[PDB]
Structure 1
Amino acid sequence: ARWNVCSYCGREFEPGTGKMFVRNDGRVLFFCSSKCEKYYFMGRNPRKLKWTKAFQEARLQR
């Protein structure tokens, strides 16, 4: 009954939900929503979005 962490928004999401994506090089990824999956695959930058944690990352990086 473990909560997973999303690779785009950085939030925790509950057991029984979400997606695991696998790349043929073994690298794994975790998504909480089709929104985040789609944005990742199309190439929106999360460091610019004020509802992610990478945004606080970049705010420190300033």
Structure 2
Amino acid sequence: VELCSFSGYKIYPGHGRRYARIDGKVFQFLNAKCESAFLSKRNPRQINWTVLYRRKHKKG
């Protein structure tokens, strides 16, 4: 069970869609909303529903 590279959620073996770049880094995305935001160069710490945001502002 991998962790999503954008939202930080857990990706189960059936779901997800990973994406490798030319530099050699592989990223796992839970759904197409996280993938569309990652390719759009959005920042997870600014996206309000990301675990990186909730860990940033100490919501949990």
TM-score computed with the length of structure 2 as normaliser:
0.79
| Alignment partner of 2:9 out of 4, 11, 14 | 11
Does residue 30 (structure 1) correspond to residue 25 (structure 2)? The answer is no
Measured against aligned partners, the alpha-carbon deviations of 1:23-52 in whole angstroms (never above 9, x if no partner) come to: 112111110111100001112222122321
Q: Pick the structure with greater CA Rg.
A: 1
Give the match for residue 41 of structure 1.
39
Structure 2 unaligned residues grouped into runs of 5+: none
Aligned length: 58
Give 1 or 2: higher helix fraction.
Answer: 1
Query: Match of 1:15, as an amino acid?
Result: P
Structure 1 unaligned residues grouped into runs of 5+: none
* Aligned-residue offset at 1:11: 0.6
RMSD: 1.5
TM-score computed with the length of structure 1 as normaliser:
0.77
